[PDB]
Structures are given as C-alpha cells and as structure tokens.
Design a protein around this ligand. Structure first.
Ligand SMILES: CC(C)CCC[C@@H](C)[C@H]1CC[C@H]2[C@@H]3CC=C4C[C@@H](O)CC[C@]4(C)[C@H]3CC[C@]12C
Ligand SMILES: CC(C)CCC[C@@H](C)[C@H]1CC[C@H]2[C@@H]3CC=C4C[C@@H](O)CC[C@]4(C)[C@H]3CC[C@]12C
Ligand SMILES: Nc1nc(Nc2ccccc2)nc2ccc(Br)cc12
Ligand SMILES: C=CCc1ccccc1OC[C@@H](O)CNC(C)C
Length: 440
C-alpha cells in the first residue's frame, strides 16, 4: 500500500535529526574555538533534538505506520514522557540562550556571556532537572489521565498509545512548559536585536565596512595598509610599509601584528579622524550639527579619505548642517567617492540620509551570530506554535481533536530537530567544523 512512501520519508527524517545533531554535538566536542558558553547551550539543544530522533520520532513512526502501539504501556509512558521532556528542555534552552545573550549584549563585555562554563553546566542540568520533573511526574503520576470513556479504554489497552489528557493538564502543561518560556524568549530576544542596533558606534561601523586583516595588504587604491584600514605608506616599497609599521608599533613585526595592537591602531586612527574634524574649520560646524549616527558616518568619511578630502564636498557639508538629508545624499552620490567604493559609500550615504543603522544591519560578525540564534528560535516557534495553538483551542472549543490533524501538527514540531544543523551551517565556524568531521 502507500505506506512505503512515508516509511522512507520518516526514516530520512530520523537520520537528518540524528546525523545532523550528532554532527553539531561532535563539532563542539572536538573543536576548541566552538567550546563557547552559547554552544554548551546548543549542545543540550542538540541533545534534546538528538533524543527526539533516537527515542521519540522512530516509535512515533512505528505508531503511525502500524496504526497501533507495539511497545507496551510502559514504553508508551516514557515515549510520551521523553517526548514532553525534549520539547520542554528545548524551549527553556532557547529561553536561557536569549536571556544569556541579553545580559551579554548589555554588559561592557559585549557579545560575551557573563556565565562561566562551569556555571553554564550547572544551568544545563537544572533545565533538564526542572524539565524532567514537569515532564515525567505528570505522566508517571497519571495527572494527565482523562475521565471520558474513549480515553479510559485506550489507557487499559496496551496496544493503544493515544495521548488523551484532561483539560487541566492541556492548559497547565502548555502554559508552564511552552508558552511562558516562549513569551519570555520572544520578548527577551527581541530586546537583544534592539540593543545590537542601538549599540552601533563608529568602531563597529568601520570594522564592518573597512574589514580586518593582520597581514599587510593593498587597499582599494593599492596603498599598503594593515589592521583595520590603517594606511602604512603611499610608497610602493614593502619595507617602507614594514619600517613605518615597526616605527608606529615599536616592535619588529615583519608585516604581521596581533589583534590587540591592531585595535590600538584602530583607536588612534579614529582619534585622528575626530581631532581632524575639529581642527578643520570647514568640518567643525557640520559635525556639531549632527546626531550621533551621522557624526559616525562623518567620522567614517574622514577615516577613509582624510580631512582635506572630505572638506571638498562643499555643498554636501552645507546641507548636512541644514539637516537636508535627502538632498545631501544626492550630492554625496554625485561624487567619485561613491564611484570608487560604492558599497561603502552607499552604507555611509544611507546613514546620513536615514539617520539610522539600517545600512549596517547584521553586517558585523557578532550580529550575524545573533541573527543565527534568532532563526533557531523563530523556527522553533513556527514549528510548535501551530501545534500548541490547536491544543489550546481544542480545549476551549470543547470538541475533540482530529487525530490526524493533531498528529500532523506534532510532526511539524518533530521536523524541528533536523533544522538546527542547517541553521548552524549558516555560521562560518560550524561550516569549517562540519567539513573536517565529514572529511570533505
Ligand atoms: C534520555 C533522557 C531521558 C535523558 C537525557 C538527559 C541528560 C542525560 C543529558 C541531555 C543533555 C546533556 C547535557 C548536554 C550539555 C553538556 C555540556 C557538557 O560540557 C557537560 C554535560 C552536559 C551539561 C550534559 C549533561 C547530561 C545531559 C543533561
Ligand atoms: C532512551 C535513549 C534515547 C536515551 C539515550 C540518551 C542519549 C542520546 C544521551 C544521554 C546522555 C547524553 C550525553 C551526555 C554527555 C554529553 C557530552 C557533550 O560534550 C556531548 C554530548 C553528550 C555526549 C550527550 C549526548 C546524548 C546522550 C548520550
Ligand atoms: N519554562 C520556564 N523557563 C524559564 N527559563 C528562564 C531562565 C532564565 C530567565 C528567564 C526564564 N523560566 C520560567 C519561569 C517561570 C515559569 Br511558570 C516557567 C519558566
Ligand atoms: C498538551 C501537552 C502538549 C505538550 C506540552 C509540553 C511539552 C510537550 C507537549 O507535547 C509534545 C508532543 O510532541 C507530545 N505529543 C504526544 C506525546 C505524541
């Protein structure tokens, strides 16, 4: 019959869950630079998805294909109990991630978790402990058992593992175990995206569109530069750029420098840009007649071109001081600066034009890491929220739920366990880690 199709489909889903989440787990286990605090949370998140694929989805596939329960009422309890455990531990983990990323993005240690690894391990156990209590106890203590005849006949029957619960459980379980951490997750992590966008200074602005290299390279004009767009010299001699590099650093570098002494150059360059805007009489009044977002966009222009080069935009300077943003943005486009480097000028002109950071959304490496964590959360919501909204309406509407429409929406939740590894292939560090494990 037509069951052979779903068997292959479900068997592939079990593989994509197991093979993908063991891949995520092993990548964090062996590789050091992925052993971060956030990735310990992802480890337990992958475990919740891995156990979903080893203990839950297969026995649910045998339940659908055989149209009955082969494994007894004992395993019917654990299968249900472990299924609830993996979903409860997943949302709280995603809830801990969001709160961890909030306290990180608000501390002066931006993008770095305040929790230590030993303490984050203490959090993981409590999540599984609290999940293990809210999941096993209501199922093992029969607090879910309904009192209507159809449920009672399935309870005593060992070949039936239909999941009928009384209305009190369906409410309290959905609220405490799913909706509360969901609402916290969505509110706390929307608070993170709002801080990353609000907390964009000139330093992150430049470091995005200027880049960072630790080896001497030629810039867009061909001049020897190093660090974050630090101009070394305009002479074609490499040692002239290396000797000027050593005079500025004080160390014999042979053209290679660390990230610490590269930020120190980056600070001095930005300081020279602000001091240069204040020395020049043509740039001083315009800088003062600007908000912090456009002050940065101005510091960026002086960073790239110098004080005298930026002062040539005599019309654009008068308009940015007259606060005529759209009109200044046009003369900024009619320049040869927008010709040589259009992608950078676009982001700077739009920063003047709009007075926001929309041109630099998710352009910084650490913001892309947050957007990655926002996708595993938004996916977790879209996979389970339909299931949980139908449970909450099923109870209120008082009509019993359609067994195929019910189990359907639970499988949209099941296929969530295979989505996390692909969203991690959207990180550059996991791609490099996965390719080693796959030996590609
Ligand atoms: C099958 C079900 C019922 C039991 C599985 C739950 C337990 C054994 C598993 C699932 C996820 C696991 C955690 C995943 C994250 C790691 C981080 C690592 O640095 C230390 C151990 C720690 C913190 C694990 C401890 C044990 C753990 C909580
Ligand atoms: C009934 C069946 C499904 C229960 C078996 C649950 C299995 C999958 C659980 C139980 C304990 C878990 C492990 C606990 C220790 C951690 C160490 C961490 O650095 C990598 C993941 C790893 C190794 C976990 C992987 C998943 C794990 C092995
Ligand atoms: N499911 C639940 N998760 C979590 N995690 C969490 C951890 C740190 C900060 C915020 C939230 N908290 C809950 C508080 C009450 C109730 Br009720 C349920 C939860
Ligand atoms: C109304 C209970 C639904 C629920 C609440 C909390 C955690 C998980 C929940 O349901 C997960 C489903 O995957 C289980 N459905 C059965 C076990 C097939």
């Amino acid at each position: 019959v037509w069951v052979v199709g779903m068997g292959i489909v479900m068997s592939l889903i079990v593989l994509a869950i197991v093979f993908g989440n063991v891949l995520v787990i092993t990548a964090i286990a062996k590789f050091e630079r992925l052993q971060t605090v956030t990735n310990y949370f992802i480890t337990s998140l992958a475990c919740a998805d891995l156990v979903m694929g080893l203990a839950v989805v297969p026995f649910g596939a045998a339940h659908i294909l055989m149209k009955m329960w082969t494994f007894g009422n004992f395993w019917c309890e654990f299968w249900t109990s472990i299924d609830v455990l993996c979903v409860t531990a997943s949302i709280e983990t995603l809830c801990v991630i969001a709160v961890d990323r909030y306290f990180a993005i608000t501390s002066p240690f931006k993008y770095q978790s305040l929790l230590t690894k030993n303490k984050a391990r203490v959090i993981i156990l409590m999540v599984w402990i609290v999940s293990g209590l809210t999941s096993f106890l209501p199922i093992q203590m029969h607090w879910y058992r309904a009192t209507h005849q159809e449920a009672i006949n399935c309870y005593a029957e060992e070949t039936c593992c239909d999941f009928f619960t009384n209305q009190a459980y369906a409410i309290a379980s959905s609220i405490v175990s799913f909706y509360v951490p969901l609402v916290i997750m969505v509110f706390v992590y929307s608070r993170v995206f709002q801080e990353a966008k609000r907390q964009l200074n000139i330093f992150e602005m430049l470091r995005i569109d200027e880049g960072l290299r630790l080896k001497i390279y030629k810039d867009t004009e061909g001049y020897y530069t190093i660090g974050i767009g630090h101009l070394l010299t305009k002479s074609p001699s490499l040692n002239a750029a290396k000797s000027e590099l050593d005079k500025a650093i004080g160390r014999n570098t042979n053209g290679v420098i660390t990230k610490d002494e590269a930020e120190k150059l980056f600070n001095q360059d930005v300081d020279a840009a602000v001091r240069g805007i204040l020395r020049n009489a043509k740039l001083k009044p315009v800088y003062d007649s600007l908000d912090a977002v456009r002050r940065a966009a101005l510091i960026n222009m002086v960073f790239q071109m110098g004080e005298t080069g930026v002062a040539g935009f005599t019309n654009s300077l008068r308009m940015l001081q007259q606060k005529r943003w759209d009109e200044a943005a046009v003369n900024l486009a009619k320049s040869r600066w927008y010709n040589q480097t259009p992608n950078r000028a676009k982001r700077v002109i739009t920063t003047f034009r709009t007075g926001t950071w929309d041109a630099y959304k998710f352009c910084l490496k650490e913001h892309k890491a947050l957007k990655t964590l926002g996708i595993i959360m938004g996916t977790f919501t879209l996979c389970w929220l339909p299931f949980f909204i139908v449970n909450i309406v099923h109870v209120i509407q008082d009509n019993l739920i359609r067994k195929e429409v019910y189990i359907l929406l639970n499988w949209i939740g099941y296929v969530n366990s295979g989505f996390n590894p692909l969203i991690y292939c959207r990180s550059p560090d996991f791609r490099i880690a996965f390719q080693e494990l796959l030996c590609l």
